[PDB]
Amino acid sequence: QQLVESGGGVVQPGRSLRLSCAASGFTFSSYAMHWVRQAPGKGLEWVAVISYDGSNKYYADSVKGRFTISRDNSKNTLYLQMNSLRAEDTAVYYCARHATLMNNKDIWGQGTLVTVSSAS
Amino acid sequence: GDIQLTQSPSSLSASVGDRVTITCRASQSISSYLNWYQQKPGKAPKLLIYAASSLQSGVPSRFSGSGSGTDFTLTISSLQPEDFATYYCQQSYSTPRTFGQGTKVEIK
Amino acid sequence: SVLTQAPSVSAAPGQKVTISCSGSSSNIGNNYVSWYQQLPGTAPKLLIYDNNKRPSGIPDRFSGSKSGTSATLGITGLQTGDEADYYCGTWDSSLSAVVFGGGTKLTVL
Amino acid sequence: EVQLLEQSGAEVKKPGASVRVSCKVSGYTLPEVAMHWVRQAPGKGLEWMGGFDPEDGETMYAQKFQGRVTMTEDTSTDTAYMELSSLRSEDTAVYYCATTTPFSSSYWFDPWGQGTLVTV
Amino acid sequence: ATRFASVYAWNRKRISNCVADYSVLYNSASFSTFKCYGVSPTKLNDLCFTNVYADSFVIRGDEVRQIAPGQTGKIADYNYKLPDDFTGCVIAWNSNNLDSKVGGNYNYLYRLFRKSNLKPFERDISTEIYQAGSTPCNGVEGFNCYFPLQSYGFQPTNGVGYQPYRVVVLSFELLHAPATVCGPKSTNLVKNKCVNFNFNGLTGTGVLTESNKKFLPFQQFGRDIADTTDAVRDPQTLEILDIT
Amino acid sequence: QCVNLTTRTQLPPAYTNSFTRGVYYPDKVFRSSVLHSTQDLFLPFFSNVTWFHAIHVSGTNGTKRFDNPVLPFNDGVYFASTEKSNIIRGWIFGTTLDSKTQSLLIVNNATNVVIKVCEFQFCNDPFLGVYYHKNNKSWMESEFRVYSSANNCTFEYVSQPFLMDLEGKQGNFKNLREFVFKNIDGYFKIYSKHTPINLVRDLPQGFSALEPLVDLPIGINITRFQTLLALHRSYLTPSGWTAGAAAYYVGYLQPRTFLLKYNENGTITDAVDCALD
Ligand SMILES: *[C@@H]1O[C@H](CO)[C@@H](O[C@@H]2O[C@H](CO)[C@@H](O)[C@H](O)[C@H]2NC(C)=O)[C@H](O)[C@H]1NC(C)=O
Ligand SMILES: *[C@@H]1O[C@H](CO)[C@@H](O)[C@H](O)[C@H]1NC(C)=O
């Protein structure tokens, strides 16, 4: 039913910041989950998947920074660590789901700002 | 390579009661795997059509999808004062997924 | 705060001198008294509780007394490492809370 | 007997903020023993704060500071949060986590808390 | 029960070592589709069972005819499979006043596809992606591959054919194991009459009377010098009954 | 949890002699003033019984000795205790005293004893911790100071407390409490009794009849066990543990033929072993 996100903030470039997003209402477990990016004034750009029902991780090669994705399924939560930062990634992120002709499960988080800059 | 999307027009300033056709074109032949979203700027993207030809709960038939292959169509009809926002198409054919650049329907 | 003791006191090493704290019947009169020690930028350590009970690890050389509204903290066998501030406290029913004095920083001469 | 966890850590919050203080324990469980709080300003004395009442079973709040600071408890994780609000001039200081016994008056506190400064 | 799961993860309850209340099953009479097998439903009141499997789920009001031992259709194809030789009863009724909610019921689910027909009585909770075409999707969704599961759409705005049934299925067997679950018979006590009897499995024939000999509570029998069963206590109403 | 304090102590197990003891009713059948004879597991008379101490102060100051060993079940088990102030609750009966087997966990947590037959993880020094909640001013019992994991559980049951006090008696009773544990034929049956005793420690010459409490489907072989304890926390004095003193009696059962003399009311007094002499 509901998705909550870890806190965004201002991080210096080259660093790492783990992204937590917990589910509620129905589990993460039976589904997949995604991350997308929205820069201000820019379109929604897909980032990376997670696939718990086997195990596989796909990343966008457009932003191929080894932003690692894995689970905490028993907390219905998902972790993607912001690795190899660069300033144009300063944006808001969303926890996502795609209706793949079968489901209607597209549920979106509230959105938190990741900021990549040396100036706080 | 990647699959390119082509969302046209990328904006359309509109009026009350219109019937706007927001087109999302595709670089490949995608079966029906395309969606549509409502986003007022700052909101969560509320899904509108799934599989490019099927309505959604809470969203009446003032929105109406059709198309296949390369050509996909957002059939907005009887344009309502709440429907003026920034919208999006969506592939789910391959990996990577890309989304359209958005189409802001806004009051003339 | 609401209690009475001096900012500082000094004495020669190895000597015997104590420190007292003057309360009222509303605070010390019906209530038990405690005493605390802190070194600069450190953890304030319980010295004596009830004026007759030593916590575990306290030298027996410390004693205490309560005479009316006055409570003295027995301090004997001064050491070079005994220089620090000692704090009196006792339960307060007035504001129904915990109260302390300003503290008295000992100096071993 | 018992050693405790720290009170906060280092919490530095510029004016226009407010800070919780989460004091955990070890060797005991949280709700077998009552916590307490004392303001200590450097170069100054003790000012008692927060606290639990052995009588009446309430968690006390220092009348002078009452309403500005609140306390909650998670019994299993031993996390007791002390939230001070509305930063002012003289209220940046070390606030000690202390613990007397609910069974008796026990004005005597736990052997020591390690202390945490705050920021205004 | 207050909460039946769907058919992709149907609940199963092994039941034995108790007694069957088969009377009010027929006296319920609020049940839409209530059929049985093995031998007649009136006959099954006493003809009893070693070990029963009570498994229940919720399906649609149209697809329930798929539930029949040895048929086809989605629920019996990929969701829940009655065997080729079956004994038990299919009990089916509507729960439209509970399940289907305004604002939409989408708690319930089912599996729509799998790469084979389903083995009998085996659930399928594996929600991984099936790849219909040859293009490997490998856990994430994609092209030629779909998601496995789908919901139902339940509201009270549905017609009568689209109403949710809480189908509970009772399945039975017979083994070297004894009839651990078995229906009746409390028999009214007869005083001073030559009467065959059974108490708690103890059997004999005697004249049962009121008797003043006084047991200790945990006890069951009395006995005489000769290792006969002299006096027994009525289990249903504790009383000391001689046996002559 | 699994907080542990072995505190191992030396000295020989202090033995004793059960004079007439451990005679239960091995049937429900009511009999009156007859001599009945069966050969069954019992604790034979004039037997060696180990007066063990779970907590033992030998005075200098304090010096509480926690000795209670894991003990084999052997054929059958007898148990006896006084414990005016209860410190004893239940027993850990099992085989591995671990997972891989079931576990018989008797907890007489006040007041609803929740017998448990499950698969647990029993710690190296298991016992029930008791503390003070501060919420509702109630002494809870931390049950995972006994065992870490509770899962897989096969059986569960609840009854009225077997352990029971009376007190107000400033002694002169000691409330001597006996429990017999016999594991056979899928039924592990529990027996009990409550008796006044004025003697300082050891047992009198009287007969103790034990009724079966519950006959339960257990189906496990129990080859070893240990008792359980109730301890608490104290606060600053020159943590607190080992509430009061604790000692009990244990002896092993054995097949023997007893002649059983029922009374007019079926209360067995005189029992006689055949093989005794
Ligand atoms: C009772 O439990 C014990 C395990 O403690 C089992 O006895 C073991 O039997 C094997 C032979 O199969 C011996 O090698 C072991 O030494 C025995 N254990 C001990 C501790 O001596 C036994 O299987 C169980 N009871 C039954 C009826 O199977
Ligand atoms: C019991 O122990 C005593 C020693 O205390 C010994 O003399 C005696 O032989 C033992 N008897 C039995 C039956 O164990």
Residue numbers in the entry:
A (entry chain O): 2 to 121
B (entry chain S): 0 to 107
C (entry chain I): 2 to 110
D (entry chain P): 1 to 120
E (entry chain A): 344 to 527, 529 to 588
F (entry chain C): 14 to 251, 256 to 294
Sentences from the paper on this structure:
Spike (S) protein, the major protective antigen, utilizes its receptor-binding domain (RBD) to engage the host receptor ACE2 for viral entry into host cell.
For each two-antibody cocktail, there are in total six copies of Fabs bound to one S trimer, where three FC05 Fabs bind on the side of each NTD and three RBD-directing Fabs bind at the side (H014) or top of each RBD (HB27 and P17), shielding most of the regions of S1. Distinct from most structural studies of the apo SARS-CoV-2 S trimer in which multiple conformational states corresponding to 0–3 RBDs open were observed, only one conformational state was observed in the structures of S in complex with each two-antibody cocktail, which also differed from the structural insights gained from the SARS-CoV-2 S in complex with FC05 or H014 or P17 alone. Furthermore, each of the two-antibody cocktail limits the conformational transitions of RBD, suggesting an additional benefit conferred during the cooperative neutralization carried out by the cocktail antibodies via interfering with viral membrane fusion. Surprisingly, P17 and FC05 exhibit a parallel binding mode to RBD and the adjacent NTD, forming a “two-Fab bundle” structure with contacts at the constant domains of these two Fabs. Structural characterization revealed that P17 and FC05 Fabs can mimic the two “arms” of a single IgG molecule, allowing us to rationally design a divalent antibody against SARS-CoV-2. FC05 recognizes an extremely variable patch on the NTD; none of the bound residues are conserved between SARS-CoV and SARS-CoV-2, explaining the virus-specific binding and neutralization activities of FC05. Footprint analysis of epitopes of these four NAbs suggests a partial overlap between H014 and HB27 epitopes, but no overlap between H014 and P17 or between HB27 and P17 epitopes. As expected, the binding of FC05 does not affect the attachment of any of the three RBD-specific NAbs to the SARS-CoV-2 S trimer, underlining the potential of these antibodies in formulating cooperative two-antibody cocktails as they bind simultaneously to distinct domains.
